[PDB]
Design a protein around this ligand. Sequence first.
Ligand code: MG
Ligand code: MG
Ligand code: MG
Ligand code: ZN
Ligand code: ZN
Ligand code: ZN
Lengths: 593, 584, 588
Amino acid sequence: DRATKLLTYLADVTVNGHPEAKDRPKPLENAARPVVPYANGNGVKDGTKQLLDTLGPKKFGEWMRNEKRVLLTDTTMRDGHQSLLATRMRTYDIARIAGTYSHALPNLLSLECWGGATFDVSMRFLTEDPWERLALIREGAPNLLLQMLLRGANGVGATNYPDNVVKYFVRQAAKGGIDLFRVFDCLNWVENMRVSMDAIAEENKLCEAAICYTGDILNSARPKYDLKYYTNLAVELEKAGAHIIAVKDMAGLLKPAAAKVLFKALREATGLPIHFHTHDTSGIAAATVLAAVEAGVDAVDAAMDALSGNTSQPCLGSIVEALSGSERDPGLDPAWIRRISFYWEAVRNQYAAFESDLKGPASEVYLHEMPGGQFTNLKEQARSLGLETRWHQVAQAYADANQMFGDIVKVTPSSKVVGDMALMMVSQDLTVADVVSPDVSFPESVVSMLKGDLGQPPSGWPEALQKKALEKPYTVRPGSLLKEADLDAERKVIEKKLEREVSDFEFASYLMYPKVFTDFALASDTYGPVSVLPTPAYFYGLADGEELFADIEKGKTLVIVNQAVSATDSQGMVTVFFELNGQPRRIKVPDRA
Amino acid sequence: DRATKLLTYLADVTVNGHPEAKDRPKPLEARPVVPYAGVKDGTKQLLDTLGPKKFGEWMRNEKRVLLTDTTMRDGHQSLLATRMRTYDIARIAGTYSHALPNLLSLECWGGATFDVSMRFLTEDPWERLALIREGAPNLLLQMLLRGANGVGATNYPDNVVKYFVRQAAKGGIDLFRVFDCLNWVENMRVSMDAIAEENKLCEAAICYTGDILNSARPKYDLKYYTNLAVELEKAGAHIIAVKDMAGLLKPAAAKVLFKALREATGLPIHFHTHDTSGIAAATVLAAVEAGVDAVDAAMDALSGNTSQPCLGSIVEALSGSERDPGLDPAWIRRISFYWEAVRNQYAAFESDLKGPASEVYLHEMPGGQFTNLKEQARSLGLETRWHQVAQAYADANQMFGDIVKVTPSSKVVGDMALMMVSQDLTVADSFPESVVSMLKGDLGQPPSGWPEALQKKALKGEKPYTVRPGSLLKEADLDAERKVIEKKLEREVSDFEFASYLMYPKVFTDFALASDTYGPVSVLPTPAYFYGLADGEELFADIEKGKTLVIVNQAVSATDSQGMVTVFFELNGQPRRIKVPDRA
Amino acid sequence: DRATKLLTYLADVTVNGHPEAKDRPKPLENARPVVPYANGNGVKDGTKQLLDTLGPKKFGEWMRNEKRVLLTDTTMRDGHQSLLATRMRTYDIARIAGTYSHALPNLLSLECWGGATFDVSMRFLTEDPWERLALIREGAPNLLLQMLLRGANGVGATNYPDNVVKYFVRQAAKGGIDLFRVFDCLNWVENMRVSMDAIAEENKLCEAAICYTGDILNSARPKYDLKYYTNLAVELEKAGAHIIAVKDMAGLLKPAAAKVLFKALREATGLPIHFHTHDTSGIAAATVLAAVEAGVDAVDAAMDALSGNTSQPCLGSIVEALSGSERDPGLDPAWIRRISFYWEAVRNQYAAFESDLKGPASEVYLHEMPGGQFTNLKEQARSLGLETRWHQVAQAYADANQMFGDIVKVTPSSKVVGDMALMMVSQDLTVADVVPESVVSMLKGDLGQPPSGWPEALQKKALKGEKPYTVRPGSLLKEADLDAERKVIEKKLEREVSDFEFASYLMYPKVFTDFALASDTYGPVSVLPTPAYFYGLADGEELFADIEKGKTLVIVNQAVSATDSQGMVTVFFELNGQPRRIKVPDRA
Ligand SMILES: [Mg+2]
Ligand SMILES: [Mg+2]
Ligand SMILES: [Mg+2]
Ligand SMILES: [Zn+2]
Ligand SMILES: [Zn+2]
Ligand SMILES: [Zn+2]
C-alpha cells in the first residue's frame, strides 16, 4: 500500500502537473542527474559535534573564542535556497550530500540546515516532513554541528505562542538533532529573547544570540544605531545566557570599514565568541566577511559557490581561497568544496521553476534595507499587484515607511509589516505626510505591530502614527499575555482529527502550524512517502515509457514504468498504466483541467 | 533615399527577423527612460591643459580614489556578448556628463566592440565614439588597445598600428589602455610610442596571473610585476594598470601588490578586474586602502560575475572614507536604473551563468572568454563535460610552461583544451591551427619561451622565430592599399573607414555594403532593430538632427508571385509600399 | 461613392464572412464559369414576338395547334429553388440569358420569377428581384419570361386585399413577365378568380394551374379521380384561362396516369396543356414522355446540371428522347450541353447550399412532400433534433394529411401539414391522439375551403372558441389605401421610391425595408461575382467588376491588418491603379 500510494502521486502529477511547477519554466530536457561524489571509505574525523558533546556549551564557546583559525558555517542547506530558490530545495537532494560534507570537510563549524522557511515550506509545498529531513542530515554528518535559525518570539511559527509551547518546541528540536540555535528578535528586544535562550540552555545546546544589524555605525547622521548600541546589546546577551554572539546582517548592509571597527569592539566588549552572518545583495559581502576575519571574528557563514551571490551568502569557496595560507587559514580543502559545489549546481538545475529574475549586485540595498531573503518575494507581490514598472517607487517607499515607523530593525515578521505599508503607499498612491496627516484603511499587520504584537522597539512607537491607525496598546511581552496551552487535550484534538496516535515531533509541528500540518498528514495518507522520489519525478511525474528507480526504504527498490495514459473517461478520471517491478498496475486519478 | 533605405530594413526584419535574435530568447512581453539630468569641467579639461605626463602626476597626488566606468564596453562585452547598441550607449552620455562629472573616464571603445558593432549590429563604431564625445566633453574617453593586434584579429605591420592610433586619437579617445597577451614589453613599444606621439594618455597594462603569495608558483612573484612596472615606465608610460582579466587577484595579494608597485614607480596605478570569484569588490577595496590611484567598476545593472564588481556598492563603501571618490549615490543608482531597463531589451544575449565561481582559481579563464568557451563546448557536444574542459584548460596552461592567458593567447589554450577533451587525449598523449601558430612565435614570446618538447612535435618540420612578429611583416603600401578598398567600394572613403578596413577588411567591406542597402540603422531604437515593428505599432526615429520620422507599420501582405512580401507603412502621414523577399 | 460602398462590402466579408456561408462547406478550390462563345450575330424572333402579335387568347390556340412539344426551362427558378435553397444569384442568371436567347430561340419560356426567388434575393442575397427580371429581359428579348404566382398571395407570405394583388400583377407585367402560372394551394377556383382577371387586364398569358395529388388510377383513393381534374379544367377555362397547367408539385403522377389524364383533359377543353413536375421519384422523365405521347402541349424541364431528384427531370435527356420523332422539340443538344456545363460551373460556387439528398425515393408516393419543401422539412427536423427519426416524420405527414380529409399539399398548405407532422413526432401523439399558429390559421379558413370543407371534430378542438369563416379570405380584407401606404414607405426611407419598390414593400414590408438600408450602405453588390460576394478576396486576388456597362473597376486586395485598438480592421485595396484603405469592425 506504500507502493500503491506512491503510484497514485506519480499518476496524479503525471496527469495534472504540480501546482508550483505547472505554469513556470521547466529544467533543460538533457540536464544530467546530480552525481554524489566518489567515497574513499575511511571513517569520519571527529569534528565539532564531538567537541560540543564532551565540553558542554559554555566550554565549547570558550574553545571557539581561543580558536585561531576562522570557523565556517555552510548555509547552502537553509539560507542558500531560501534566498535563491524560494526554499524549495528537497530532502532528497539535501540528505544525499550530508555524508560527503562529513567525510570531506570535517573542519567545518556547522551546517545551517533548519528553521527559517524550511519548516512550513517543506510540508506546505514539498509534501515532506522537516523532522525527517533533519534526522537524515544528522545520520549523515555525525561529526559536524547542525545549526538552525530560530525566532525568539515565534519558534519557527507565524504567530506568537504561549511559553510552554515555545519551550516544548526547543526541547523537540534539540532531541531531533539541532546543536546550534541561532536565535533572534525582530526588534533586537532582549526581553523577547529570554524565554528562548533559557530553553536552549535547559536542553544543554548552543545558544547563539543574534543582534540584527541595520543602518550604518560609521554614519553620524544615523545615531540610533551606533557602535555602543551593538556592544551594549552583546553585553546584555552575555548576561542573558548566550554562548555565542551573532551579527545577523539580514539585508547584507555592513560595509568593510564598519567591520574593522565592529568586530574589534565586540571582541573587547564580551568574552563570547562572535559569529558573522550576512548576504550579498550588495555584491561586496565577501569584502565585509574578509574584514571581519581580519578583525578576529571567530566564525562566518558562507554558501557553496553554486548557491552563493546576490540575495544569498557570498561565495564560500572563494572566501576560503582568499584565506588560504593566512594566519587564520580555515583548514578546508578547495577541491572538495568545488566537488560539492558541482553537485549543488547539478542539483540547482532541477529547480528552474523557482529561479528569480535578479541579474546582479544592487547598491540600492543601502537605500531600502530589504532583507536578502525577502527581496524576491516582495517584488513578486509587487507584480501581483501590478506595479512591476514602479518597483523603485516601492523601493523608495519602503525606505520612507522605515523612517516614519521610527527607523526600525526590519526582519521577519517586522519586515512584512513595512512591506505591506510600502505596497499600500504606492498603489493607494499616498505620501509620508498622508500617513502623518490630521485630516486610511490600515493593513492588518501594521495595526497589529503598533498595538504591540511584535514587541517593543528601543524607544517605543510613534505616538501620532499609532492613534490614527489603531484601541489601547500593551507594552509588555506579547507571549506573557497568551494563556499557556493545555498540551494534553490539544494532543487529543489532533489525534481525534487524524484518527491515530501522533508522535511528539508531529505534535510539535501541529502546535507550530496546525492547518499546514493537518493538510500534510492527510496528503501523506494518500500519497505515501513521496519525499523519497527524486526531484524531477516529484515535480513532473514520468514521461511516456519512462522508467524510474525509487527507494521505498533503505534496501528496497521499486522499478516503475509509465506504459500508457488513457483518455479522460466518461466519469472524469484518467487511467495511468504502470509496470511495478514487472507486474501490471492500473491507477485511476482525476482529470483536473 | 535614407528614409526609404530605413523602411526597407525595418520591413526585412519585421518579416524575416534578425539572424542573431530570431532563435534566442525574447525580452519580457518598458522603454528605458533617460534621467532628466552647463557641464562641470572635469578630467577631459584637466588633460587638455596639463598634457599626458603631468596629468599622470596629477592622478598620482590625488587623495580621492578615481573611478573608471566600464559599463559601455566591458560590462556588456562580459555579460551580453558585446551587443550593446550605439542608440542605448549614446543617450546616457549626457547624463554621465551632468550627473557624475567627477569620474576619471568612461571605458566605451576597444576590444570586441569594433569588430561586433559592424559585423553583428550593422553600426559604425566611429559614429558611436563621436556621439559619446559630443555627450561627455568633460570626461576622458577610454579604449582598450591591443599592442600588436590593434583591435584586429591578426598582427599588422608597424605602420598600420601607427595609423590606427592616429585615427583613434582624432576620433576622440583620451585614454589608451594597451596590453600585450604575454606581457611582452618589446611588442608593446610600437603602440606606446604612437600614443605618446599623439600627445594622448598611454596606460601600459600589466596582466595579472598566478598568485604572488603562493610560493609553489614562482614564475609570477612580486618582483616580476615591479620589474615590468619599472620597465614600462622606462618604455614611456603615463599610467600603469593592473589588468586582472581572469578575476584572480586576492585581497591579501592586493594589499602587498599596490604598496610594492607605487614604491617601485612614480606613475599612478589603475586597477582593472573581473568579479568571477564573487569576491573582486574586496580586492578593489584592498587596492584602494593600499593607495591605488584609479579603479574600474561597472554600473550595478551590468556588474558582477564575469563583469566588473558593483560600482554603486564600491563607492557606497568608500563614502565618508579619507578616500571618498566624491560620487553621488542617488545618481549612480538612477543611472543603474537606466541600464536595467536597457539590459532587459537584450534578453537574447544573456548567458546561463548563475553566480560566483572559485573554479576560476583553477582554470584561470578570462571573464570575457568564459561564456564563449562554454557555448563552444556545447557546440561540439561537450556541454556535459564542462568541468573536464575546465580541468583541461588548467592542465594545458602548465604544459605551455605556465603562461599569461588573455586574447589571443586565451583562444589557443581554449582551442587546445577542447581537442584534449574531444579527442579524449591527455598531456602525456593532429594539433589545431592556432596552436602551431602560437608555438611558432606568432602570438609573441614568453619569459622562458616555448617548451622544446612541445615545440618539436607541434611544428613537425617548420622553424620557429623569436623576434617581434611585426618586424617580419613589411611596411604596407597604405597609398595603394587605399586604392583597392576604393575600387571594390566604387567610392572615395574616409580615414576612419580606411582604419576600419585595415583592421577588418572583410567585416568592413560587408558593412559598407549593408550600410548602402539599409542606410543608418544605427538610429533605430533596439526593440525595433531586432524585431521590426508589431502590427499597428508607431515609431519615432531621428535621421537628421532636427528631423523626426513617424513610421507606422499598418499591415503586412501575403507572399507574392516573385516570392516578395509587401509591407504597408505610413511615413509622416504618407503611405509607402516596401517589398522584401520571404527568406523563410 | 458607388465604388466606395462596394469596397466596404468586400472589406467586411473578407474579414467577417457571409452569415449564410460562414460555416457551411466551401467550394472546391481547384473553375470560373465561362459564358459560351458568341458566334451568330443577331437573335431570331421567338414566342415573345408571336405573343406580341397574337395576344394571349390567340397565342394559346397557337400552342394547342403546334405539333412539336414546347419546352419551358426551369433552371432559373424551380431548379435552384429545389437544389440550392433558392440561392442562385442575378450575377450568374443574367450572364447566361443572351446565350439562351442566341442558342435556344425555340424555347417556350424561361421560368425565372416568383416561387421563393422574390424575397430570398433581398432577404439572403442583397439583390433586387426587379433588377434580375430586367436583366433577363434585356438578355432574352425573344423568349417568354415566366413566373410562378400564388394567386391568393401573389409572391407574398400572407393573404392580401384584392387591390394589393392587382397592384403587384400590374407592375409584374411592366417588369417583363409574359406568362403567369397562377395556382391555388387548395385548388379553389374562387381564390384564383381575382388574379386570373388581373392577368387578363394586362393582356398577358394567364396559365391556370390544377395542382395534382393522389393517384387517379387508384379506385380506393377516390376523392381525386379523373372527373376532379377535367372539371377543374372546364372551370378555369370559363374562368378566363389562356392555358391550363397540371402542377405536379411533388412528382406524384406516374406514367400510366399521364397517358389517361392528358388525353382526357384535351378532350375536356379546347385550351393547350402545360405540365410541370418534380423528379424526386426518379421516374418523372417517364411521365413527361408519356405526356408528350398523349399530346401535351408543353412540358417543364431543367438544365442537366440542375436536374433530377427534387428538381425537374433532365431537360437534355428529355430532348434526346424526343429527337427525330414527330413531336421533336427542335432544340440543339450541343447547345443544351454547352449551357448545362455553364450551370455546372455556376453550381460549384454554391457548395454551401447543397443538401445531402442522395438520389430517387419511391417514398414520395407515401408522404407527398413537394420537391420544393422536402429539404426545408428535413432541416427543420434537424433543428428540432429529429434527424435519426426522419421516416416517422414522413409517415406522420401522410397520416396528418388523411386527418384533414385527403387534401392538396402545396405552399402554404404543405407548410401547415409539415408543422403538424413535426409536432406529432416531437410531442409524440397519434392520429386518434389528435382526433400551432399555422394550423389554427388554416382551420379557421385563413387559407381557403377544400372540396368538402374541413373536418368537424378537428375544427372544434383546434380553433377551440374561435368561430371560422368559409368565404374567400381577401373578401374579408378591406381595400388597402395604397396612396397613404406609400407615404409610410417614403417617410421611413426619407426618399421617393419607384412603382416596383412600392410593390416589394406591399408584399414584404419588413424584408424590403431591411434590404433598402443594406443597399444605401453597401451599394450594387449584385455586380460582384459569386465567389467574391460570399467570401471576399484572398490576399493578392484581382477582381473585375462592372459598376456600369461601360466602366469596369479593377479591385485588388493587397493586405489586411490586425485589429486596431478601437476594434477596427483595415483592408488595403488598389482600385483601378490607386491605393484605398477601408476600415471595418471585427464582428467575431
Ligand atoms: Mg576563535
Ligand atoms: Mg592619487
Ligand atoms: Mg400543341
Ligand atoms: Zn540570512
Ligand atoms: Zn576586462
Ligand atoms: Zn415546382
